[PDB]
């Protein structure tokens, strides 16, 4: 089922509409005339749809009309520009780097009183190490502009300076990136002297991980304790309390972790170590078979999803009743997760007939991936236009569909069919498992590609033997999305194996992650 550009313009803006516009663009079906008023019909003007539309209508914009004259100057003529223009152009460190040193000295004096931040950057670029100059002034704003300009700068930072960095909004991403990428070792070592009083939440957590890489277990405990006290989400608290336990072995930490309302790998592990029963998994079994909603219509999902997200307690009860059917089970569960304020545990098994002939271990992995990828919504579409319950990108879907399986009249929109999604998911999971074995490693590869997973596993500091392994390595996966994805899919997999009466102990999974 195609949609022409006319039909699409009559639909509301969404990721579904973006997807169908992108399909027209890749097939060269959008003329220069169709493309004129098209920016206002795109929900997320980023990535592939933007670069494709810009081959048709290339946009020169956007400079602010107030500062238009300021962008006519260059490095050779900046001293002819008025003071407002000079200051605007000095926002760019590349521009500052391009200036000659006589003109940097001149501008530095011009700006000493009213903007000493500019003065420090100007004079810093007259040296062979701008980072060293900015560090000596303890100019915190300048430090972050330099780091964003270039990641190669690396230098030891003293106690006074590192303790000022956390007050800047850049700090969290700065600390995480250098820690998980294992870059800027002098910055990393310096961050051992940040007082836990001065950090919180994610920044405290990563400063704890950093302390562990230098075997500073006492500093690590203090950071993780601060993370546990300050974290918003119960899931992140648990992650931090686990580390508190692993380092200092206090049984009250483990007990607290075993009694957590969040179902995650850390609370599940704590329950297993204390002989606490497996948590209660809700049971959704609607008597009503079907209703008038079309689960194969991606536009209807975008519409109903926005209703659900932007609704009061009263409207969620009406929606709950309407979608309490077998045909709409994934929507029901979606509504109930928001109706109960994320307190209860929903692990549905929809369109089960398509997977009941696989072994129960494979069933659980399929279900665990699907739960995380789409919450079982058949027409789910990601921002990169991954499609259906198992979130296949068009390239992979066409390779499997057209070349490998030779399906007649295959179109990528077949990924919206549960039968096809599960089938292809099984096929692709088969390929990943034969090479990787652990369901955790499969999950990393399913999300980030087998390329990066093999690169990570080929390193001699990842998933090898050690005091805190494999738990330390799970915190050092070099992409945030993949670190998180793996933890969640692993918990899902444990739960689904339990519901299917093929339980496995999570301690066995953790033992199999250590490469021998």
Author numbering: 18 to 533
Sentences from the paper on this structure:
We report here structure-function studies of soluble periplasmic LT of Campylobacter jejuni. The LT Cj0843 was identified from a virulent strain of C. jejuni and localized in the periplasm. The LT enzymes cleave the PG MurNAc-GlcNAc glycosidic bond similar to lysozyme with the noted difference that LTs have an additional (2nd) cyclization step; this step requires a boat conformation of MurNAc leading to a 1,6-anhydromuramyl product as the predominant terminal saccharide moiety. The crystal structure of the soluble LT Cj0843 from C. jejuni revealed an unusual doughnut-shaped structure containing four domains: NU-, U-, L-, and C-domains.
The structures from both crystal forms are very similar with a root-mean-square-deviation (RMSD) for 509 Cα atoms of 0.75 Å. At the N-terminus is a small helical domain (NU-domain) connected via a flexible linker to the helical U-domain. This flexible linker (residues 75–83) is partially resolved in the P3121 crystal form and fully resolved in the I23 crystal form; it spans 22Å between ordered anchor points I74 and Y84 in the NU-domain and U-domain, respectively. The most prominent feature of the electrostatic potential surface of Cj0843 is its predominantly positively charged inner ring surface. The outer ring surface of these ring-shaped proteins shows a more random distribution of positive, negative, and neutral residues. This ensemble of positive charges on the inside of the ring of Cj0843 explains why the majority of sulfate and acetate ions, that co-crystallized at 200mM concentration in both crystal forms, were observed along the inner ring of the doughnut-shaped Cj0843 protein.
